[PDB]
Design a protein around this nucleic acid. Structure first.
Lengths: 46, 91, 61, 246
RNA sequence: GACCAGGCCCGGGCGACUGUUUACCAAAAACACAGGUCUCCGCAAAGUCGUAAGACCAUGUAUGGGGGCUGACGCCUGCCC
RNA sequence: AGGGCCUAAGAUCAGGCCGAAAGGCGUAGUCGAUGGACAACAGGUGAAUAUUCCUGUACUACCCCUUGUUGGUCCCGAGGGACGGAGGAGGCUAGGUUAGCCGAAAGAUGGUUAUCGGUUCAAGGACGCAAGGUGAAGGGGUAGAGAAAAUGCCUCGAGCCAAUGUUCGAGUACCAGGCGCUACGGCGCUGAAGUAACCGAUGCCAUACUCCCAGGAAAAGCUCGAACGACCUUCAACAAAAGGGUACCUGUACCCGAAACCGACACAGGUAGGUAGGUAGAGAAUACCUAGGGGCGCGAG
RNA sequence: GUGAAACUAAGUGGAGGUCCGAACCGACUGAUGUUGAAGAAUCAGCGGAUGAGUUGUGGUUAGGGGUGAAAUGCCACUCGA
């Protein structure tokens, strides 16, 4: 009885905010260098 | 209202003639030119396409440190740059 | 020591140096405008050092 | 919350010229600004207290009011009050702690606060922690008030005043306890006079340890501190003041 | 077992204490300090900066704000106008 | 990465005030990142560039067309962006080690294979959350100047929030080792195994949790929304759908714990941030090493 | 253990201008250096090292001035102007 009116909205909202948090996890990992995973697999030095 | 800065009909100074350019003609299917320092990508693609009647997948440009803009002009898989450039005296 | 000493200069952005001594600064002030009068009068090739372009090659973004 | 706004003036010991006129400022902690309605000019609209909270910009606490029609304001917390208590501003209204009313209709001798000096402005007198005024008399156009300083002053009778003493009476029972506590409170060190050189301060110089040698105790700028009045002379308000302080 | 990795105790002066200071001869017993006391100021506040406008004080209002001296804490602080 | 977006400190300031001149104050605004807001990764190539060129697989913003609704758009009123320090526990991963699996193996000396190598894969799409945390997250109408916030009503397979993880991306590669080059450089063919266990971060969950007081930026993008006031309006504005089609300016070299910046020097000096391997150790100290880089521009006695 | 407070044993907890000690910031002692490797360094040790802490970027204050936890110290190897 219209019991998925949450799960219509909640699903797409979750998929939005997971994208957003993914992209923000990228943005902050660019600023302090240490991004493009070629570099990260290359380096492990001390 | 088109051009950032109006410049000319002219724009394109000359094609670069060297060993890198000849190889890039074969590999990338792309021409190489020296243009106006105040030349835009949009401006170059409108010029060269409208001049030779050929398509332009993309243009990519830089300013060599003296201050003269050189542009790589890439062409579609259809149009053949080797034979095109042959009839403008590069081969 | 670990603090270096009596190097009056450092490596500082040309932005800040152009906002302290650049053309657009000198040109605003009436007192400072008469400095350019003296500089053209003496006939110095470079009027005010420490000017930058907003454009490339010497851009300080 | 649209009442808690980060709109500081910044620096805040420095004038227009950019010189430190008000001395011994800086360091501090970053703080925000709570607007507080000292006017309390939302008239005949019945209000309800909800929370008592810390204002970093004061001695006394702030009180968050929700009005019946549905809008919110910050005010000064009165002494006895608690969460979920009730208030109202207007002309009639009872003399229950934390209500607002013009000085004419008020009882003789009541502990009050937030008093205007000029009608229209807002509320200037008795704003600190424990601030308390006691209406002594009334005379024609005027009401005769005794202030927290211990001074009796004629002010206009139509002017506003909020009933009750202002809360948080115990903030004299700090010890601070350390240099660092006053440093992060906004204040900064105060260098004595007699210590400095003659070029800097009047007491300055002197070989060995210096006695305050120049007949008087002086400011930095020549004007005898420690006994010497400074209430202009023939100021506009002169007539209205009745007494001194303690 | 190498490199690495507290010497400890008893008695006195000064300053309570962490702190700051003479870049390039002085780091302290010097300054600051919490605490104390006095004196000014009722808001168009005293004070400060400005020829002025006006700015700080304060978007603060006497449990607050300016200035003098003393310098935790304990017991004190006499005579002379 | 910056600019074509946004604002702080600060700057300049229309009208306005004040001043012999020069100018000073100051609102509306406008600039001003060190901050907010925004869309890409791997492999490949090459004398000198590569998240920029190549190959694959992605994503953001616009113009088509299928459904539509009648207005849009700005101003404007709200939500939100949105913020402290300290501490601690849990779940994870990056990274490490060991085993297994696969290939190779004489290293001239008592023994000895106990030896040596490899065991790799990003962004993004689709999909679920546990003795991880909590037990209103997310809605819908209604009164009263009231569309939001606020005083009373109900309803929730009683659940939510996330980093990791399962798949495709990736029957491709990448790949240790073998089989041929001909002179001072890499390059053609081939191509095995490609897993498990334990340790494990200062990395992520977390703008989470507890505690504390000294009480912790703004503005736009974003989402609502009812007004009033203007514009743009029936070859049109806002919503959704696959497939298309389209893609501005500047920086990019090289040094950057330095013989290239700053110290007059190819000067025993100073210089913001990022990545952090093994053995021993509490440890980013130390000692010896790996990857990587060097033997300090006078030598001989 | 009390009329209840008070008080006291064990757990939990993670305060502190707390302790020891790298980076970081300093500059106490010596040795070296003195036409230096350096117009304040090298070396060996030293203090703080979660705070009144350090520091990048971008700004503010101007010489009858500024700034100064105050030495007349600092304000571009210049400071009783």
């Amino acid at each position: 009885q219209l019991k998925l009116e949450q799960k219509i909205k909640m699903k797409m909202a979750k998929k939005i905010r997971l994208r957003r948090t993914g992209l923000c996890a990228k943005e902050s990992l660019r600023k302090r260098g240490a991004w493009p995973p070629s570099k990260m697999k290359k380096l492990k030095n001390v | 209202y088109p051009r950032r800065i109006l410049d000319v009909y002219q724009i394109l100074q000359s094609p670069i003639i060297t060993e890198a350019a000849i190889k890039n003609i074969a590999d990338e299917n792309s021409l190489l030119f020296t243009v106006d320092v105040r030349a835009d990508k949009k401006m170059i693609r409108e010029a060269i396409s409208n001049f030779f009647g050929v398509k332009v997948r993309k243009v990519n440009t830089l300013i060599r440190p003296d201050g003269t803009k050189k542009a790589y002009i890439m062409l579609n898989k259809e149009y053949n740059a080797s034979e095109l450039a042959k009839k403008i005296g590069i081969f | 020591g670990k603090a270096a000493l009596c190097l009056t200069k450092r490596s500082r952005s040309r932005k800040s140096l152009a906002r302290t001594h650049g053309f657009r600064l000198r040109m605003s002030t009436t007192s400072g405008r008469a400095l350019l009068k003296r500089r053209r009068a003496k006939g110095r090739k470079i009027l005010c050092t420490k000017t930058n372009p907003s454009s490339g090659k010497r851009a300080s973004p | 919350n649209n009442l808690i706004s980060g709109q500081r003036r910044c620096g805040k010991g420095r004038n227009a010229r950019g010189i430190i006129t008000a001395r011994h400022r800086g360091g501090g902690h970053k703080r925000l600004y709570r607007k507080i309605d000292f006017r309390r000019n939302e008239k005949d609209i019945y209000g309800k207290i909800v929370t008592i909270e810390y204002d970093p910009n004061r001695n006394a606490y702030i009180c968050l009011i929700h009005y019946g029609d549905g809008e919110k304001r910050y005010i000064l917390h009165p002494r006895g009050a608690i969460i979920g208590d009730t208030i109202v501003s207007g002309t009639e209204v009872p003399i229950k702690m934390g209500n607002a009313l013009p000085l004419t209709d008020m009882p003789l001798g009541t502990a009050i606060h937030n008093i205007e000096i000029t009608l229209g402005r807002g509320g200037q007198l008795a704003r600190a922690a424990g601030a308390v005024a006691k209406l002594i008399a009334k005379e024609g156009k005027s009401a005769t008030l005794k202030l927290p300083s211990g001074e009796v002053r004629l002010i206009s009778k139509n002017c506003s005043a909020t009933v009750g003493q202002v809360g948080n009476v115990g903030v004299n029972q700090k010890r601070l306890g350390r240099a660092g506590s006053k440093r992060w409170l906004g204040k900064r060190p105060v260098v004595r006079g007699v210590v400095m050189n003659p070029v800097d301060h009047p007491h300055g110089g002197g070989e060995g340890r210096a006695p305050i040698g120049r007949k008087s105790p002086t400011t930095p700028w020549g004007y005898p501190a420690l006994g010497r009045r400074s209430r202009k002379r023939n100021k506009y308000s002169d007539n209205f003041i009745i007494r001194r302080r303690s």
